[PDB]
C-alpha cells in the first residue's frame, strides 16, 4: 500500500522543450511502477492510438522494458507515426517496424512553440539516398549530392543541406502548427519484469 516506484513520466512529458524530429531522444524506463493514469491528466489529445495492447487495461498489463520517444511534428503529418505508413516523416526521420507494439500519444502545443516572428528550432530531414531500417536515427548532416558533379564538401547548385527547418508561427492554422508527439514502445522477453501496476489494496 506504499507505492514508491512511480515511474518518472512527469519528466518525459512537460519537458518544456521537445527536441526536433531529425534527432529524437530515446529514454529507457524499467524497474519501477508505471501508473499510466497520470498520463491522462493533460490536454485533450489529437491522437491516442494503441496498437498492441488494449489501452484501458494499461495498469495491470506488465512489461520488461519500455521506451519513451518524443518529438515535434507538423500537424497534418501526425498520422504518419503509425506502423506501415509511408511518407516523409515516417521514411526519413522515424520508422516504426510493422510488428510494432506500444501506444502513441499526440497532443497540440500551438501556444508553446511559436513566436510572432517565427521559430526555426525544429529541423527535419528532407533528402537522403535511401529509407531507414526500423528504429534507427541519422543525426549526421552530409551535404546531399544530387547532380552528377560532387558538392566539394559544402552546399552548391543542386547540392543542399538535407535538413530543413520548420516555420512555426502563432498565426498558422490548425494542421500546420507543432503537435508534440510521444511514442511508448513495449517489449516482453525472459528478464525481470518488475513493470506492473500499483496494487489496489486496503490498509
Amino acid at each position: 500500500p506504499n507505492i514508491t516506484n512511480l515511474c518518472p513520466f512527469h519528466e518525459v512529458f512537460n519537458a518544456t522543450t521537445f527536441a526536433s524530429v531529425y534527432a529524437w531522444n530515446r529514454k529507457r524506463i524499467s524497474n519501477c511502477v508505471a501508473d499510466y493514469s497520470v498520463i491522462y491528466n493533460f490536454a485533450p489529445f489529437f491522437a491516442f492510438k494503441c496498437y498492441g495492447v488494449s489501452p484501458t487495461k494499461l495498469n495491470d498489463l506488465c512489461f520488461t522494458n519500455v521506451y519513451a520517444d518524443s518529438f515535434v511534428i507538423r500537424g497534418n503529418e501526425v498520422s504518419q507515426i503509425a506502423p506501415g505508413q509511408t511518407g516523409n516523416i515516417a521514411d526519413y526521420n522515424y520508422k516504426l517496424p510493422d510488428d510494432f507494439t506500444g501506444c502513441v500519444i499526440a497532443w497540440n502545443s500551438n501556444n508553446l512553440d511559436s513566436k510572432p516572428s517565427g521559430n526555426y528550432n525544429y529541423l527535419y530531414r528532407l533528402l537522403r539516398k535511401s529509407k531507414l531500417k526500423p528504429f534507427e536515427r541519422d543525426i549526421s548532416t552530409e551535404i546531399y549530392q544530387a547532380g552528377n558533379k560532387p558538392c566539394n564538401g559544402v552546399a552548391g547548385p543542386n547540392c543542399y543541406s538535407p535538413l530543413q527547418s520548420y516555420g512555426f508561427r502563432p498565426t498558422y492554422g490548425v494542421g500546420h502548427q507543432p503537435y508534440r508527439v510521444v511514442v511508448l514502445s513495449f517489449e516482453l522477453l525472459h528478464a525481470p519484469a518488475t513493470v506492473c501496476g500499483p496494487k489496489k489494496s486496503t490498509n
Partner: antibody, heavy 128, light 110 residues
Framework: EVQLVESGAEVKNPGSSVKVSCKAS????????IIWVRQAPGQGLEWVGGIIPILGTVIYAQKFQGRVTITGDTYAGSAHMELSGLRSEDTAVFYCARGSYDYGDRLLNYTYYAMDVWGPGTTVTVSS | QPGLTQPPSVSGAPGQRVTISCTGS?????????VHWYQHVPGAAPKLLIYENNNRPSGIPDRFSGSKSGTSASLVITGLQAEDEADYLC??????????FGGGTRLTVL
C-alpha cells in the same frame, strides 16, 4: 485542406509587365513547391515556371526564359511571379499549383509527377 | 504547341464505357516519362484524376481509369453521367522542352 488565394484581374497595355501572387492558406508552403501555368484563350495549357521555395532552386520554360521571374517566401509564403513584355498573345489566365510530394527523392526531380491542388486563376489582359 | 494531340471531343451517351486518347512521341513520353490526367471545369480550377500512368488518387470513385501502351496512352470512364461534362487533359515531361500538355477534350453528353 489547402487553398490558393490569388489576386484579381489585370488590365494593361502591350510591352508592359504584370506581377501576381499565389496566396496560400495558413501560410506554410512547407516544402510543397509551386508551378506557374498559363491558360491561353481558346487553347490548351502551357507550363511556364517552377519554384521549389525552401530550396530556392527555380526553373523556367525555354519559351519565356528571361521574360518571367518568380519569387516565394514559404513562411506565410505568397510566392510572386511577374511576366514582362505583355503583348496581344499574352492575354490569358494564370494558375498556380502544388506538387504534393515534399521530400528529396522526387522534389529535385519535381517537375515530373503531379500537381495536386490548384487555384481559381487570374485573368491578365492587354489593351488593344 | 508540340503537345499531346488527341481528338477534339466525343459526345456522351448515358451510362457507358468511353475511351479517350493521348498520342505523343517516344522521345517525350515513350522513353521513361509518365503521363498525367486532369479534369478541368471551364472557368474554375482543374482537378487531378490520374498520376504515374496507372495509379488512382483517393476521392475519385472507380468510374475513372486509364493506362498507357507503346507510344501513346489513354483514359476511360465507366458509367457516363452529365456531371462529367468537362474538359479533360493529359500532360507529361519533354526531353525536348520541359513539360508538355495536351489539347484537352470537351467531354459532352446529349
Amino acid at each position: 485542406e489547402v487553398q490558393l488565394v490569388e489576386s484579381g484581374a489585370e488590365v494593361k497595355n502591350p510591352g508592359s509587365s504584370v506581377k501576381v501572387s499565389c496566396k496560400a492558406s495558413e501560410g506554410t508552403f512547407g516544402s510543397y513547391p509551386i508551378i506557374w501555368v498559363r491558360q491561353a484563350p481558346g487553347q490548351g495549357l502551357e507550363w511556364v515556371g517552377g519554384i521549389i521555395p525552401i530550396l530556392g532552386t527555380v526553373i523556367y520554360a525555354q519559351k519565356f526564359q528571361g521574360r518571367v521571374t518568380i519569387t516565394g517566401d514559404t513562411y506565410a509564403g505568397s510566392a510572386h511571379m511577374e511576366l514582362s513584355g505583355l503583348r496581344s498573345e499574352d492575354t490569358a489566365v494564370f494558375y498556380c499549383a502544388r506538387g504534393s510530394y515534399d521530400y528529396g527523392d522526387r522534389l529535385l526531380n519535381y517537375t515530373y509527377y503531379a500537381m495536386d491542388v490548384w487555384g481559381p486563376g487570374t485573368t491578365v489582359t492587354v489593351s488593344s | 504547341q508540340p503537345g499531346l494531340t488527341q481528338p477534339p471531343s466525343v459526345s456522351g451517351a448515358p451510362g457507358q464505357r468511353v475511351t479517350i486518347s493521348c498520342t505523343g512521341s517516344r522521345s517525350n513520353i515513350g522513353a521513361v516519362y509518365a503521363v498525367h490526367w486532369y479534369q478541368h471545369v471551364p472557368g474554375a480550377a482543374p482537378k487531378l484524376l490520374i498520376y504515374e500512368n496507372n495509379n488512382r488518387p483517393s476521392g475519385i470513385p472507380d468510374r475513372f481509369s486509364g493506362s498507357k501502351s507503346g507510344t501513346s496512352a489513354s483514359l476511360v470512364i465507366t458509367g457516363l453521367q452529365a456531371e462529367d461534362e468537362a474538359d479533360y487533359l493529359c500532360q507529361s515531361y519533354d526531353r525536348s522542352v520541359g513539360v508538355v500538355f495536351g489539347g484537352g477534350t470537351r467531354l459532352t453528353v446529349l
